[PDB]
Amino acid sequence: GVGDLIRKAVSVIKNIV
Amino acid sequence: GVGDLIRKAVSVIKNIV
Amino acid sequence: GVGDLIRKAVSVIKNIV
Amino acid sequence: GVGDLIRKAVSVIKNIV
Amino acid sequence: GVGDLIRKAVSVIKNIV
Amino acid sequence: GVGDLIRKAVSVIKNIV
Amino acid sequence: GVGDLIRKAVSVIKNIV
Amino acid sequence: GVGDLIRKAVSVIKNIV
Amino acid sequence: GVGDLIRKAVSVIKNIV
Amino acid sequence: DLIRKAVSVIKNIV
Amino acid sequence: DLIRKAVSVIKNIV
Amino acid sequence: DLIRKAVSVIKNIV
Amino acid sequence: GVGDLIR
Amino acid sequence: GVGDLIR
Amino acid sequence: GVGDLIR
Amino acid sequence: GVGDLIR
Amino acid sequence: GVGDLIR
Amino acid sequence: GVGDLIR
Amino acid sequence: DLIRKAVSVIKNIV
Amino acid sequence: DLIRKAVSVIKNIV
Amino acid sequence: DLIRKAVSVIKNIV
Amino acid sequence: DLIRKAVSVIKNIV
Amino acid sequence: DLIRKAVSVIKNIV
Amino acid sequence: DLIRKAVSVIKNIV
Amino acid sequence: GVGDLIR
Amino acid sequence: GVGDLIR
Amino acid sequence: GVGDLIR
């Protein structure tokens, strides 16, 4: 819109043994 | 809209043994 | 809208042995 | 000053019929 | 000053019919 | 000053019929 | 961690006459 | 970590007369 | 880490007379 | 009959 | 019958 | 019958 | 609709 | 629609 | 539509 | 260690 | 270690 | 270590 | 004696 | 004695 | 004695 | 009369 | 009379 | 009379 | 003013 | 003003 | 003004 701000942070981990 | 702010943070873990 | 703020934080864990 | 924070949000509406 | 923060958001509407 | 932050957002609407 | 927030503000004064 | 935020502000004064 | 943010602001004054 | 039907609708979501 | 039907619609999403 | 039908539509998304 | 404004 | 404005 | 504006 | 998974 | 996965 | 995966 | 000793350790700090 | 000693260690810091 | 000693270590810092 | 008049002023706004 | 008048002013705005 | 009048002014805006 | 500091 | 500092 | 500093 007008002056909007968006932040996204994602972390994924898969340990298979 | 006008001056909006959005923040998202996600973490996922899968340990399979 | 006008001056809104939103924050989301999520954590998921699955330990399978 | 030191570490201050200020937030202002304003909305005005005028419907004339 | 030192580490200050300021945010302003404004919305104005005029419907004339 | 030192490390200051300023944000301004403005919206204006005029519907004349 | 996930979505954490930390704020610190400090002021020190020493007047010696 | 994931989506973390940190803010620090410091002020020091020494008047010697 | 992932999407981290850090801000530091410092001010020091020494008046000797 | 000058203006048989007149209608106004206003929606403001803020 | 001058203006048989008149209609106005206004939507403002902010 | 001068103006049989008149219509106005306004959409503002901000 | 029908709105009269005179100022 | 039908709007009269005179100023 | 039908809008009259006179200023 | 010793983990058996069958799906 | 010793992990057996069959899917 | 010792990991067996069959899919 | 097939597997004399088996050990698993999992630490999750979030 | 097939596998005398088996060990697993997992550390996740997030 | 097929595999006398087996070891796994995993460290994830995020 | 060595120092007839001495004055000090300190203002700190934080 | 050595120093008839002495004055100091300090203003700190932070 | 050595130093009839002495004055100091300090302004710090931060 | 008149300030004496000795350290 | 008049400030004496000795260190 | 008049400031004496000796260190």
Side-chain angles (χ1 to χ4, degrees), chain Q:
Chain Q
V2 163
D4 294 342
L5 292 93
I6 178 158
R7 62 180 288 176

Side-chain angles (χ1 to χ4, degrees), chain S:
Chain S
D1 194 3
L2 192 72
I3 317 291
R4 192 169 181 87
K5 183 180 193 183
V7 182
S8 296
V9 181
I10 298 176
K11 291 177 70 68
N12 304 301
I13 305 178
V14 188

Side-chain angles (χ1 to χ4, degrees), chain T residues 1-12:
Chain T
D1 194 3
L2 192 72
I3 317 291
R4 192 169 181 87
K5 183 180 193 183
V7 182
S8 296
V9 181
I10 298 176
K11 291 177 70 68
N12 304 302

